[PDB]
Amino acid sequence: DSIEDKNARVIELIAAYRNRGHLMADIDPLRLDNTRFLTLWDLDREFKVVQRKKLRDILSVLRDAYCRHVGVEYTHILEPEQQRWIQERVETKHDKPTVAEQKYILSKLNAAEAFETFLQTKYVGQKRFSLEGAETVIPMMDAVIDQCAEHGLDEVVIAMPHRGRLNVLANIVGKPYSQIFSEFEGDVKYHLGATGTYIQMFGDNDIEVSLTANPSHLEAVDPVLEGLVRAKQDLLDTGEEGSDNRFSVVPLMLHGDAAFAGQGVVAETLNLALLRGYRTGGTIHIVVNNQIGFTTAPTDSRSSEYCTDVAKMIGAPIFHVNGDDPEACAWVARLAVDFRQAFKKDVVIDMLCYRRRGHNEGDDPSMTQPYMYDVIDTKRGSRKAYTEALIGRGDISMKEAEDALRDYQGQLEAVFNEVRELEKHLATAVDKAMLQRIGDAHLALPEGFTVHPRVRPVLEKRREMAYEGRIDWAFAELLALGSLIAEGKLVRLSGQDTQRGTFTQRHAVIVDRKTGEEFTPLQLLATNPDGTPTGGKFLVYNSALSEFAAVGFEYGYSVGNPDAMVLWEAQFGDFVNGAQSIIDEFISSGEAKWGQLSDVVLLLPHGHEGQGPDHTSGRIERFLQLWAEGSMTIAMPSTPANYFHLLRRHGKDGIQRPLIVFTPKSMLRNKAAVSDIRDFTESKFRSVLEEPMYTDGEGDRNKVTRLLLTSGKIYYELAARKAKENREDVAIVRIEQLAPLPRRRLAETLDRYPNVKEKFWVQEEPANQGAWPSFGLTLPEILPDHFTGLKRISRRAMSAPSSGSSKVHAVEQQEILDTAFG
Amino acid sequence: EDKNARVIELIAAYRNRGHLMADIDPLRLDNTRFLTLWDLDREFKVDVQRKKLRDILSVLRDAYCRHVGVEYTHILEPEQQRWIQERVETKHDKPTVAEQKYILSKLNAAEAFETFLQTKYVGQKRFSLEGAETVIPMMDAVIDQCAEHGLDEVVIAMPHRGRLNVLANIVGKPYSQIFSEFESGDVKYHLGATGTYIQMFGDNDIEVSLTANPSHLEAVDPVLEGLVRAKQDLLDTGEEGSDNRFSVVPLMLHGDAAFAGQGVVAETLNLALLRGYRTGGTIHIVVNNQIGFTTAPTDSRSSEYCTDVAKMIGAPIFHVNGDDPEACAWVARLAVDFRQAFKKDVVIDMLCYRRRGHNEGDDPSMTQPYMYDVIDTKRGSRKAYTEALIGRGDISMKEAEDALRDYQGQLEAVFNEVRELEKHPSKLATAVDKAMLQRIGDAHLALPEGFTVHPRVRPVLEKRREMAYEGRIDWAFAELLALGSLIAEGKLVRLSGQDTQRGTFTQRHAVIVDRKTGEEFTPLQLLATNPDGTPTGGKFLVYNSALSEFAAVGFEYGYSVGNPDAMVLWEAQFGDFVNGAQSIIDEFISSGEAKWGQLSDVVLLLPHGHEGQGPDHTSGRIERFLQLWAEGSMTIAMPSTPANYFHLLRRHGKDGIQRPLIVFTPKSMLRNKAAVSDIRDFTESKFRSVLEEPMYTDGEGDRNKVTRLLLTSGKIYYELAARKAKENREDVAIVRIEQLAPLPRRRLAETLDRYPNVKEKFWVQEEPANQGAWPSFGLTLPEILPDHFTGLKRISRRAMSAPSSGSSKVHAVEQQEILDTAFG
Amino acid sequence: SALLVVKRGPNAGSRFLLDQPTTSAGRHPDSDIFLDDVTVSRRHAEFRLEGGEFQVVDVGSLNGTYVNREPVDSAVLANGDEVQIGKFRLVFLT
Amino acid sequence: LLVVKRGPNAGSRFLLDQPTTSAGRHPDSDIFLDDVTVSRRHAEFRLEGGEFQVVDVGSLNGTYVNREPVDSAVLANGDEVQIGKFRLVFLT
Ligand SMILES: Cc1ncc(C[n+]2csc(CCOP(=O)(O)OP(=O)(O)O)c2C)c(N)n1
Ligand SMILES: Cc1ncc(C[n+]2csc(CCOP(=O)(O)OP(=O)(O)O)c2C)c(N)n1
Ligand SMILES: [Ca+2]
Ligand SMILES: [Ca+2]
Ligand SMILES: [Mg+2]
Ligand SMILES: [Mg+2]
């Protein structure tokens, strides 16, 4: 072998360390895997790298950069400038931290361990939430926040599971012990949100630090955190919808090793990282990798080398770091923030540590992991180990070690003392000009814009509707959103193909036929006729093909900005069961559990049209089952004007409560399902609606002996059958607001039909679905003088939302109408 | 020296990033997509060979920058990188004329089928494969390569696009069945199918099947894996087999926007190498038409490729030009070879286009004018491939005419057939004998020689032998008695879930770990062998799952579909986390039989009960499962005794009916000393859908003294019974409904008739008034049994927006209030 | 008079008598030997009998006609020969 | 006189009119500085004759005077004293 052959192997060796050195790094503080770890004469031979270096010197730089307490994964990144940035900061001789910095890390380890000792000594059942063996996450998190403050950023928003939460609250968020342990019994405090101010120890800046609320459902909060941060960024005019590119609100997402690899919402949330409608300018992820998930070993938890491998999905750099090295942990945390600031992309920190105690109380973890726990039993605490390492290296004197010990005792006294002291003692109507302005906006096209020939009639029809009436559902929605933007409200609308609309009805964004340029007619309403801004905005997006992460994000966004109108639209309501964890754990229940309020709107296209069991139902029955007084508003409007007033009421009521709307599909193009101008200018939301022959016509309510109560599009088919047979003995009353039940309005309406001898709840849905399961039980109870004897007319009970046959659908639909008028 | 360093770095640059420059897009939408000249004739040493720079560049550009983009240097295993490198960095032999004509025959059938579908029926545009027809010769090449390895079956999962095309041209189903009474569209877009594939050029046949699926994109991915795993365990191949062939292959199809956005994709990839879930590698095909309805890829994903999630498990990724059917078939064969060599997932990203709009009347130029102006210039895949063969002189004009006649005949074959088509519960004993109980008890102490039991586990083993011979059988042992007796009778039992080997509440110990070596021992596996040494045919497959609910529940549903004779149980850590698998519950478990005729006997074990641990550690949402139920879809139960749970599982496993079972299981009731069963309950009884208090059935209690009846289910029974005993309340009786669905109407009526002096009836439950069994029972009981349940009142927690309060003190106050009201 | 037995294909075991001057084999539903598969062209092959001699002729199929795994335009058949038409394998017997 | 310029109690004033004024996390401190970065016994403000002196009494994070670490320092009007994350200005 010649110098030419020797060179080729040296360049291949340099590449091998850059690509795979992380597989040999000393990252495990337990050293469980023993098997984990050119000739000798070539060591003093020089090689071109435009430097010249001896092979021993090349090896020394490579082993220090890639094979000590930090394992770097970055050659998978497709952007070469990002690879070079990491390479330059990792392949250099590092300046040892100053004694003041080392003592500061020790002070944080003192506070972390003193807090855990307090928690495990004072209370029962705290073992499951213990941070013992992972305490280095406290100086790590502190280094993340300090680095964000160093960049002069505005806020760090944290999301995390239970492990170390109270520790984080005290030692990171800075909440007093008297508030954390107030009436402490695990506790609800493990789930609550918090805010505080972080002050740099060595720098000139302060930064807000907050923590979002979350359920026990590991990782479900990940997309909620992203939406909350985006909402705050939009308010601060930073990031994607901001005049600056600082993304000055930082998501800091904490995870566990087994949950990060197994929960699909992790991948869904990473997939939002660079999207125009969802990007937050990069998240800082910290995985508390204690190499166990309750009793489960990593080999049964994941199919890859690392728990963090999913982050390779978006080309994020990954830093595997030894939790027994708090200096390497703090350094990795600062580098992660710097990378996030430089490239506005996610960084993942895999902190390798251990779980000192059993997962629960009384649990002896040597039952299922005897080898791991025999090794853990030999481990000294992170604080004692770091104190001893500082003495050994001569970084601190024995007098300073004694100072550190007295500091630790004082940290212990401080928390016991404080807890000891605590235990002792409006119209939604708009004027004609407003309707006309929104209509005219659809034709106020930019100079030289080419409308698609199939889109142009929609624009012209909207101006026609705004001035002359017969307003359809899709325009009534834009009238609601547009009038809110003109009144200074931020409106955020998103979902799958939501810009155009699944049923080609919305056209919130129109595309130039020759250039592809976009035009948003409702954005013109963000400017008053005189040219001044209203303060309003239209943020409309096509989401990713997600339900869990997308619904989570919109819930999060509404929490981050309570003054925003936030709407998420399902392609068909049948796909919202993909976001069941957000509905159950956040939307329907967050106010009662955490005092956390949300005004998020869910739009669920619903209706029996013979398109099958996945294109028929938004499961009204599930949302009604989840409901309890004051938790959500649930509606199925039958008219475009009533939908318009429902959205405007929701946006202007000053109440933060989720709204669930079962929206139409074929009823979008039903010519009978149109509204008059008067319905927008001189009316309000109608929780209960009567037939126009009684309110506007000459119909006689006294002739009615059979009352049909219903909701949604089946109203029009019932009304048509009544008109066909000239059935004056039958009346159809619509319940527009399904929850809260409009008890008073419903009673006052039914009293206007004195000769009614029988009442029926009519619905398209199977008997075990729709509004019947809750209404059949609740109506005779809350209105016994009106609804005792109430009977049901519906499709038979089914294990699916509908039949899979359109012919069977049509036969069943006719059977309901025939029974209603039989 | 500086030149060699550049050449070696250039070789690495093509291997790592050549795929970014490859000609993979048939539309060429992105125009911007695409050492000196004297160095081209200089020789350099390469891995040991000597080659000119121009020759190195030529091999690299042919391997990495033509119609195939290879992604493999991310793979951590160097032998896997070398294997790909050797097959990709070689001069390839052009396909023979017979092979090219075979690909053309498959393109003929694909396009003829699409022409038929778009011409005969309305509303077929949304499911069109036009612009992606090359997926048919690609899939055919995958299956043919699997048959070449002598494998047993390929099982396909896919969404709607091209499904009927796949049914006809891949599965081999006749047109008279595919188009029978033809109308998400027709139900046939969702149904399962089986067929036999015969190699055109080789000696083998291979079974080809297609699993059923809902419209929920990607939800079927973990169902496919479970089904494949169950079939592999049956054929004694794979993880739980005597051979390592994994002779049943998952073929998973996807769309570009769904593959990147649906979390179940990552959850399913995460199972790929797990001992309890691995299927020896899935072949993935992404039909990447660079659009998702009206959405552009930039709003769909945060990465260069829709396939980047597969990097999670170090899978090789092949981006291939859909306008090159030879490159597509070659990539398909190489993917099968890699899957066979390393038992790992391979992803094929097939770049193509969507010729038509995603819906009828929908002009896609409204939202994508540029893409559709380019698509309008594209010639069909078949015409393009036919013309290319003529141009290159691979086929004569006489053979092109042969191919055209063949195409016309493929068209006539489908039109003619459709025109002609248009013209035209076992209830045997679940009781076991004493010897059976004793054998399962003794198995817990029949430890391997030298096995060191953990000191806290040893009393559990000894208590089980004690219970087997003497009684007071607890819940955890009764479960293992059920599973053990089924294994002794020759049944395969698969049990899994989070920490299911030991049990979340440290109660199961299905697997015990040697204190000194970490070696595992499974006491119930000893029941797979008869006393005489012969096998029973039974097996115990028990695993700790990944921290997933969606993929894990999907897999277990899939497994039961794949092996209907298996006992398949999935256990939730707490029933409160099963809402993570809501799409499987709604789209498969509760509804698959009525929608597709697809049967499943999967068991869901949901730990449930109000104990003051908060809203995420209290409820498996009984009310949601009762709301989903309709006659014959599922069995829903909340047993109160260990023997009744034992009989419920044995009835479920022995009835010869494939129907899911939902069990609301206990937590603190596991250690309730009153919640124990006698030996006679296992040996001389059966499952009891309705249970009375033992003082009336076995004691001297007088039913005629009862004026107030308390109807309930689950653990609250014991608190009600203890309050009755404390106050000697002879005027009150407690009846348990053990089987919540189907409602045991006749047994409940016969039981209530035994209390003639009852003046009032109450449904008592722990759950909030809008949860538990009250919303369905409050409505159904007065209607199905009006002479018994008219006037039925509710005693429960108040209605709540969450399953419980977050305070244990509030819980305790509410629990006492229910008991006080029940006996007030 | 001779016989064709299907050895591979969905109709394996099926027998066809060759006792007329021309016997058509293809995907056309009117074929004397209807071979229903996408790998078989509408008009694929013909079995032509003349003076006790049986001959297989490819009549312009896409996937060709094989006799003892060798592609042919036309071939004189002999007892025991394997004929391949698409995925179908037939044995010719006397 | 000492005024807190940085810390949760910013704007709080403390009079130095005794021979020794303790500053630390001990709840009995003359200047109670409640933060994890402040040791139980951190610093002392000593008055001898006409001069005011700051003395570090063995804290972990040290005592800084005008951004420099000190064991002891004679204070002068306008000097900034750092005790943990707290920043105090010394005024005459
Ligand atoms: C979505 C979800 N599924 C299941 C659980 C039950 N659970 C609680 S802790 C745990 C293991 C967590 O492992 P890991 O993510 O490594 O975190 P660690 O406890 O080790 O910090 C599980 C399965 C949960 N809380 N959330
Ligand atoms: C889980 C789920 N969410 C939403 C939909 C609605 N949907 C039907 S087609 C479509 C887009 C599919 O895009 P892609 O995956 O690229 O497949 P393509 O139609 O392009 O083949 C969507 C959102 C669905 N069927 N499933
Ligand atoms: Ca509101
Ligand atoms: Ca069964
Ligand atoms: Mg863990
Ligand atoms: Mg697509």
mmCIF file of all heavy atoms in Angstrom, chain B residues 161 255-258 287-293 295 354 358, ligand 6:
data_model
loop_
_atom_site.group_PDB
_atom_site.id
_atom_site.type_symbol
_atom_site.label_atom_id
_atom_site.label_comp_id
_atom_site.label_asym_id
_atom_site.label_seq_id
_atom_site.Cartn_x
_atom_site.Cartn_y
_atom_site.Cartn_z
ATOM 1 N N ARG B 161 -57.233 3.840 -4.300
ATOM 2 C CA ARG B 161 -56.691 4.077 -5.643
ATOM 3 C C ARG B 161 -56.144 2.796 -6.290
ATOM 4 O O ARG B 161 -55.183 2.210 -5.794
ATOM 5 C CB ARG B 161 -55.614 5.165 -5.648
ATOM 6 C CG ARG B 161 -55.255 5.612 -7.061
ATOM 7 C CD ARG B 161 -54.340 6.831 -7.088
ATOM 8 N NE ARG B 161 -54.858 7.952 -6.278
ATOM 9 C CZ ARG B 161 -55.809 8.804 -6.661
ATOM 10 N NH1 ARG B 161 -56.354 8.709 -7.870
ATOM 11 N NH2 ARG B 161 -56.195 9.780 -5.854
ATOM 12 N N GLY B 255 -50.231 6.208 -0.130
ATOM 13 C CA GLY B 255 -50.250 7.453 -0.873
ATOM 14 C C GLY B 255 -49.215 8.350 -0.230
ATOM 15 O O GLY B 255 -48.925 8.185 0.960
ATOM 16 N N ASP B 256 -48.675 9.321 -0.997
ATOM 17 C CA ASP B 256 -47.621 10.230 -0.557
ATOM 18 C C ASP B 256 -48.036 11.132 0.609
ATOM 19 O O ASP B 256 -47.250 11.264 1.553
ATOM 20 C CB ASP B 256 -47.069 11.088 -1.711
ATOM 21 C CG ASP B 256 -48.085 11.870 -2.529
ATOM 22 O OD1 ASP B 256 -48.973 11.233 -3.140
ATOM 23 O OD2 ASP B 256 -47.962 13.123 -2.601
ATOM 24 N N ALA B 257 -49.231 11.761 0.556
ATOM 25 C CA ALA B 257 -49.612 12.662 1.652
ATOM 26 C C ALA B 257 -49.916 11.884 2.964
ATOM 27 O O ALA B 257 -49.536 12.360 4.033
ATOM 28 C CB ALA B 257 -50.808 13.519 1.261
ATOM 29 N N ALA B 258 -50.598 10.711 2.870
ATOM 30 C CA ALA B 258 -50.975 9.884 4.022
ATOM 31 C C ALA B 258 -49.772 9.248 4.689
ATOM 32 O O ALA B 258 -49.752 9.142 5.920
ATOM 33 C CB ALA B 258 -51.968 8.789 3.610
ATOM 34 N N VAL B 287 -47.431 5.148 -3.817
ATOM 35 C CA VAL B 287 -47.941 5.627 -5.099
ATOM 36 C C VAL B 287 -47.842 7.156 -4.966
ATOM 37 O O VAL B 287 -48.766 7.823 -4.476
ATOM 38 C CB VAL B 287 -49.368 5.080 -5.400
ATOM 39 C CG1 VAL B 287 -49.937 5.679 -6.678
ATOM 40 C CG2 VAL B 287 -49.360 3.547 -5.484
ATOM 41 N N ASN B 288 -46.663 7.691 -5.297
ATOM 42 C CA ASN B 288 -46.378 9.106 -5.093
ATOM 43 C C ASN B 288 -46.711 9.938 -6.342
ATOM 44 O O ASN B 288 -45.855 10.201 -7.198
ATOM 45 C CB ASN B 288 -44.927 9.266 -4.671
ATOM 46 C CG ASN B 288 -44.480 10.664 -4.350
ATOM 47 O OD1 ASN B 288 -45.259 11.615 -4.304
ATOM 48 N ND2 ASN B 288 -43.183 10.811 -4.123
ATOM 49 N N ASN B 289 -47.963 10.401 -6.398
ATOM 50 C CA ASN B 289 -48.486 11.189 -7.504
ATOM 51 C C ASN B 289 -48.294 12.685 -7.229
ATOM 52 O O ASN B 289 -48.851 13.528 -7.933
ATOM 53 C CB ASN B 289 -49.940 10.831 -7.805
ATOM 54 C CG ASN B 289 -50.850 10.840 -6.602
ATOM 55 O OD1 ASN B 289 -50.565 11.460 -5.582
ATOM 56 N ND2 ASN B 289 -51.967 10.148 -6.692
ATOM 57 N N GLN B 290 -47.461 13.003 -6.201
ATOM 58 C CA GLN B 290 -46.978 14.339 -5.855
ATOM 59 C C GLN B 290 -48.110 15.311 -5.599
ATOM 60 O O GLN B 290 -48.012 16.494 -5.902
ATOM 61 C CB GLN B 290 -46.043 14.855 -6.982
ATOM 62 C CG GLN B 290 -45.020 13.776 -7.443
ATOM 63 C CD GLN B 290 -44.200 14.233 -8.608
ATOM 64 O OE1 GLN B 290 -43.399 15.166 -8.482
ATOM 65 N NE2 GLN B 290 -44.395 13.591 -9.775
ATOM 66 N N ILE B 291 -49.183 14.811 -4.994
ATOM 67 C CA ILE B 291 -50.383 15.578 -4.669
ATOM 68 C C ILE B 291 -51.200 14.757 -3.656
ATOM 69 O O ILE B 291 -51.099 13.516 -3.618
ATOM 70 C CB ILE B 291 -51.189 15.948 -5.979
ATOM 71 C CG1 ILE B 291 -52.196 17.108 -5.732
ATOM 72 C CG2 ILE B 291 -51.865 14.713 -6.644
ATOM 73 C CD1 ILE B 291 -52.877 17.664 -6.958
ATOM 74 N N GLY B 292 -51.973 15.461 -2.840
ATOM 75 C CA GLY B 292 -52.893 14.844 -1.894
ATOM 76 C C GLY B 292 -54.190 15.589 -2.010
ATOM 77 O O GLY B 292 -54.347 16.625 -1.366
ATOM 78 N N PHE B 293 -55.066 15.146 -2.927
ATOM 79 C CA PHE B 293 -56.350 15.788 -3.236
ATOM 80 C C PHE B 293 -56.054 17.169 -3.886
ATOM 81 O O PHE B 293 -55.652 17.200 -5.047
ATOM 82 C CB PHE B 293 -57.279 15.864 -1.994
ATOM 83 C CG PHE B 293 -58.746 16.176 -2.243
ATOM 84 C CD1 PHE B 293 -59.682 16.053 -1.223
ATOM 85 C CD2 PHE B 293 -59.181 16.653 -3.481
ATOM 86 C CE1 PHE B 293 -61.033 16.361 -1.443
ATOM 87 C CE2 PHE B 293 -60.529 16.954 -3.702
ATOM 88 C CZ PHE B 293 -61.449 16.803 -2.679
ATOM 89 N N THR B 295 -53.945 19.355 -2.146
ATOM 90 C CA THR B 295 -52.788 19.808 -1.385
ATOM 91 C C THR B 295 -51.440 19.437 -2.034
ATOM 92 O O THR B 295 -51.183 18.289 -2.406
ATOM 93 C CB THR B 295 -52.903 19.273 0.052
ATOM 94 O OG1 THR B 295 -54.236 19.514 0.529
ATOM 95 C CG2 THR B 295 -51.889 19.900 1.007
ATOM 96 N N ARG B 354 -51.329 12.068 -11.073
ATOM 97 C CA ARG B 354 -52.756 11.759 -10.972
ATOM 98 C C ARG B 354 -53.387 12.364 -12.210
ATOM 99 O O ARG B 354 -53.547 13.580 -12.273
ATOM 100 C CB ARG B 354 -53.340 12.315 -9.666
ATOM 101 C CG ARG B 354 -54.699 11.727 -9.263
ATOM 102 C CD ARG B 354 -55.381 12.597 -8.193
ATOM 103 N NE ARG B 354 -55.638 13.928 -8.747
ATOM 104 C CZ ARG B 354 -55.708 15.044 -8.045
ATOM 105 N NH1 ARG B 354 -55.604 15.013 -6.722
ATOM 106 N NH2 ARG B 354 -55.877 16.206 -8.657
ATOM 107 N N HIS B 358 -59.394 14.577 -8.248
ATOM 108 C CA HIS B 358 -59.708 13.717 -7.105
ATOM 109 C C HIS B 358 -61.221 13.459 -6.952
ATOM 110 O O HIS B 358 -61.604 12.561 -6.215
ATOM 111 C CB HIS B 358 -59.136 14.323 -5.824
ATOM 112 C CG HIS B 358 -58.930 13.345 -4.710
ATOM 113 N ND1 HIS B 358 -57.681 12.789 -4.459
ATOM 114 C CD2 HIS B 358 -59.805 12.896 -3.779
ATOM 115 C CE1 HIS B 358 -57.840 12.016 -3.397
ATOM 116 N NE2 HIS B 358 -59.109 12.030 -2.965
HETATM 117 MG MG MG E 6 -51.028 11.515 -3.492
#
